[PDB]
């Protein structure tokens, strides 16, 4: 049927930044979704609603390792979400509630 990542509730796939802003409304503390840029796959962007607005955290790749702060690194995107769900660790909020997809 698909990959583990494709069936994740927070993963929306190839949607634009403007469409991500429309989904994460009204602003909810912890409401988040992960969008993929149609670059180039898989240029991901962690879209999370904090302090009344949507903050966009762009995923970067250093030697096939995923990060959004150049401090904490992950093997894959699903490890990134799992980590930031539990603790903020520099982010504006914990990834509390995923936007249903």
Numbering used by the authors: 73 to 173
Copy the relevant paper text:
C-terminal Src kinase (Csk) and Csk-homologous kinase (Chk) are members of the CSK family of protein tyrosine kinases. These proteins suppress the activity of Src family kinases (SFKs) by selectively phosphorylating the conserved C-terminal tail regulatory tyrosine. Csk and Chk both contain SH3, SH2, and kinase domains, which are separated by the SH3–SH2 and SH2-kinase linkers.
Mills et al. studied the unique disulfide bond of Csk SH2 that is absent in other known SH2 domains. Crystal structures of both oxidized SH2 and C122S SH2 were solved and refined. As the structure refinement for the oxidized form of L-SH2 progressed, the maps indicated dual conformations for the residue C122, which were successfully modeled as such. Therefore, the high-resolution structures of oxidized L-SH2 reveal dual conformations of disulfide bond that were not observed in the lower-resolution structure of full-length Csk. X-ray crystallography data were also consistent with the NMR observation, in which most of the changes in chemical shift took place in the residues close to C122, and this area was likely to undergo greater structural change than in the C164 residue area. The S–S distance of the disulfide bond was 2.0 Å, whereas the O–S distance in the C122S mutant was 3.7 Å. Formation of the disulfide bond assisted in the packing of αB to the hydrophobic region of the protein consisting of βC and βD. The crystal structure also revealed that the linker region fold back on the SH2 domain. Additionally, the hydrophobic interactions between L77 in the linker and L149, F83, and Y116 make the linker fold back to the SH2 and thus stabilizing the structure.
